[PDB]
Design an enzyme around this catalytic site. Sequence first.
Site, PDB file in Angstrom:
ATOM      1  N   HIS B  41      80.937  60.049  10.498  1.00  0.00           N
ATOM      2  CA  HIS B  41      82.395  59.485  10.715  1.00  0.00           C
ATOM      3  C   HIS B  41      82.997  60.538   9.217  1.00  0.00           C
ATOM      4  CE1 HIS B  41      80.395  56.898   7.379  1.00  0.00           C
ATOM      5  NE2 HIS B  41      81.796  57.627   6.064  1.00  0.00           N
ATOM      6  N   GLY B 143      83.509  57.461  -1.206  1.00  0.00           N
ATOM      7  CA  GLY B 143      82.816  58.900  -1.900  1.00  0.00           C
ATOM      8  C   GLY B 143      81.422  58.861  -1.728  1.00  0.00           C
ATOM      9  N   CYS B 145      79.123  57.677   1.060  1.00  0.00           N
ATOM     10  CA  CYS B 145      78.490  57.842   2.013  1.00  0.00           C
ATOM     11  C   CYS B 145      77.999  59.413   2.080  1.00  0.00           C
ATOM     12  CB  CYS B 145      79.632  57.738   3.483  1.00  0.00           C
ATOM     13  SG  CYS B 145      80.581  55.906   3.381  1.00  0.00           S
TER      14      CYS B 145
HETATM   15  C1  LIG Z   1      83.777  51.301   1.699  1.00  0.00           C
HETATM   16  C2  LIG Z   1      82.856  51.578   1.174  1.00  0.00           C
HETATM   17  C3  LIG Z   1      82.113  51.083  -0.251  1.00  0.00           C
HETATM   18  C4  LIG Z   1      80.353  51.318  -0.629  1.00  0.00           C
HETATM   19  N1  LIG Z   1      79.863  52.402   1.122  1.00  0.00           N
HETATM   20  C5  LIG Z   1      80.641  52.347   1.163  1.00  0.00           C
HETATM   21  C6  LIG Z   1      82.022  51.979   2.147  1.00  0.00           C
HETATM   22  N2  LIG Z   1      82.189  52.396   3.366  1.00  0.00           N
HETATM   23  C7  LIG Z   1      82.931  51.363   4.260  1.00  0.00           C
HETATM   24  O1  LIG Z   1      83.253  50.338   3.778  1.00  0.00           O
HETATM   25  C8  LIG Z   1      83.909  52.559   5.295  1.00  0.00           C
HETATM   26  C9  LIG Z   1      84.098  53.808   5.328  1.00  0.00           C
HETATM   27  C10 LIG Z   1      83.482  51.821   6.665  1.00  0.00           C
HETATM   28  C11 LIG Z   1      82.490  52.963   7.228  1.00  0.00           C
HETATM   29  C12 LIG Z   1      81.850  52.435   8.895  1.00  0.00           C
HETATM   30 CL1  LIG Z   1      80.924  53.900   9.757  1.00  0.00          CL
HETATM   31  C13 LIG Z   1      81.771  51.626   9.234  1.00  0.00           C
HETATM   32  C14 LIG Z   1      82.643  49.966   8.284  1.00  0.00           C
HETATM   33  O2  LIG Z   1      82.684  49.170   8.612  1.00  0.00           O
HETATM   34  C15 LIG Z   1      82.529  48.249   7.833  1.00  0.00           C
HETATM   35  C16 LIG Z   1      81.135  47.767   8.449  1.00  0.00           C
HETATM   36  C17 LIG Z   1      81.404  46.219   8.475  1.00  0.00           C
HETATM   37  O3  LIG Z   1      81.289  45.358   8.972  1.00  0.00           O
HETATM   38  N3  LIG Z   1      83.146  47.073   8.818  1.00  0.00           N
HETATM   39  C18 LIG Z   1      83.353  51.063   7.805  1.00  0.00           C
END
Ligand SMILES: Cc1ccncc1NC(=O)[C@@H](C)c1cc(Cl)cc(O[C@@H]2CC(=O)N2)c1
Lengths: 304, 304
Positions: B41, B143, B145
């Site tokens: 991603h 950040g 990830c």
């Molecule tokens: C913002 C944040 C805070 C802390 N760690 C990682 C993040 N990541 C996220 O929440 C973000 C960037 C993200 C990426 C991916 Cl691959 C899938 C996503 O969908 C979410 C999963 C669900 O249910 N909805 C969301």
Amino acid sequence: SGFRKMAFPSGKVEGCMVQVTCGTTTLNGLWLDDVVYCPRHVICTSEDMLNPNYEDLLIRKSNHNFLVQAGNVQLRVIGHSMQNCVLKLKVDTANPKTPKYKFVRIQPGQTFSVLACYNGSPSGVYQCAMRPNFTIKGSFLNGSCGSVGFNIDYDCVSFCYMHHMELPTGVHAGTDLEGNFYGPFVDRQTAQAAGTDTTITVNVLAWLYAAVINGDRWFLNRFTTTLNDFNLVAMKYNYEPLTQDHVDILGPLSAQTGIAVLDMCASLKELLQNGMNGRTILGSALLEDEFTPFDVVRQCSGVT
Amino acid sequence: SGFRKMAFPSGKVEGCMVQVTCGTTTLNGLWLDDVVYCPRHVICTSEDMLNPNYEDLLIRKSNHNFLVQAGNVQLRVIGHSMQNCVLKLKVDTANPKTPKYKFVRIQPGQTFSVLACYNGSPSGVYQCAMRPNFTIKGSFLNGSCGSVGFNIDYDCVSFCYMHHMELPTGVHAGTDLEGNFYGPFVDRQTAQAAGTDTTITVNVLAWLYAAVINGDRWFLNRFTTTLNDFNLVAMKYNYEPLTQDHVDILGPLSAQTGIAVLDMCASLKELLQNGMNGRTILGSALLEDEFTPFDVVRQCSGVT
Ligand SMILES: Cc1ccncc1NC(=O)[C@@H](C)c1cc(Cl)cc(O[C@@H]2CC(=O)N2)c1
Ligand SMILES: Cc1ccncc1NC(=O)[C@@H](C)c1cc(Cl)cc(O[C@@H]2CC(=O)N2)c1
């Protein structure tokens, strides 16, 4: 989001851990530049830990009696001296892995990471706090002496603690990197009184702000209090008195959440008087006091 | 004595953390040998995280669009490929700090350390568990990830987790180092169901053994139970069913303490039915399930 008891990355400190052997005793040393720092009780036999005369015990010791090993290589000891409760072993080689470092003596209520070590080898890293009674509730076994407590600011490691002993109560006592014990403790095998351990009020409040920041808001109420009204409650529950300095330190957290410090104090007062009623705050069933307001801001903003 | 949620020393993993930038997105990568592993991603704009076609999105990307920085030095990308939900960036330089490593896919109930990172720089280390519903209750921000979960056996780092996302519930989802998500989660910004999260019964029991080993014995009773009688209680309280394998794994702890596994199960049953009554176990007011029997033995014996 999410809130965990997070320790600093231990790499810079792992590169400083050495093994120090004196006669039959093996413990850990901290190698920074051409000096190895370790607890002076390395020179003690079991028969003399009851009432040792360290000055007399050290006289019967020469540079060649201090075996210092960094990994699998032996370090040559060219000097030895006693500074308070630590021994300083001058070695002929500077640690190539010496990070930028400071020796600091922390305040009670402040937190730090511990790299637990055995035989100069690191086994784990955990976050703890210097308790108001100057003890630390750590995880240490025989051989862990010389394990250090530190903090990191960007690239500088501030060494604040060196592990020396476990009290019969199961709590841990030790010194700063100049050999001065935190608290009234002495490196003697005798009955030592830890003292009453109060709760670090400012830290519990900082953790309540972290809880709100991360969605846990059930404990927020329609009330407020004053420093004197809150402190009457704090005394009853063996909590540290909250001062204007504490309110000021909580400022950025109060600003970020829009919740006045005294309003959070009323939530804390209600939690102290009524309990959690079977509920949790950041996955905990008790009020957590080992996160400073700096730890909360750091963890909620992502400082590397 | 003492018992803490202890993470592995993070040094070997800090030397692998790099920053990966693709267009406007910056996240963390893991540099092992001449390959940088990161969440796919990284190639996603905010407008397409809702329903991305990663194969189509990757086609519009060349080796020069992946900016890899290790500290202050830029790495030259000579190859790029997608393996499940991770991207593998072939670089022209092998990581001189590559430790001995394995890629392993852990079981739910198993624990591991996380080195939280931002911009390729480590900020902290904490111990967590793969929940029975395949989520992790971590501390991650934007950040973070690409931050990895690992275990250490002497000198070999077993990488088990790579952080990919936070669910709207605040829990974290991610993959093994082959890009396969733990659980039913997809790297898509959509409503995802975490699922019911049960308590890891064998871990709570291991922690009860650690409590006894460290002096906390108030919860020990005059009763015993059977696997079927205990499991009837476990179901009611959303606890994982205890099997003979779990009893066998608890063997060394049962032997060390002289307390039969089924006797400890009766203590657990009484704690589940009656609660703590305002008391604590190893400084906790709830039953802790993020210590495996291996973690307990390791921490109570001092394995480095
Ligand atoms: C913002 C944040 C805070 C802390 N760690 C990682 C993040 N990541 C996220 O929440 C973000 C960037 C993200 C990426 C991916 Cl691959 C899938 C996503 O969908 C979410 C999963 C669900 O249910 N909805 C969301
Ligand atoms: C065995 C052990 C376990 C874990 N960590 C360190 C240790 N350390 C100890 O308990 C030992 C070796 C020790 C050294 C010193 Cl300098 C003083 C001592 O007196 C204790 C303090 C008190 O009260 N009685 C005891």
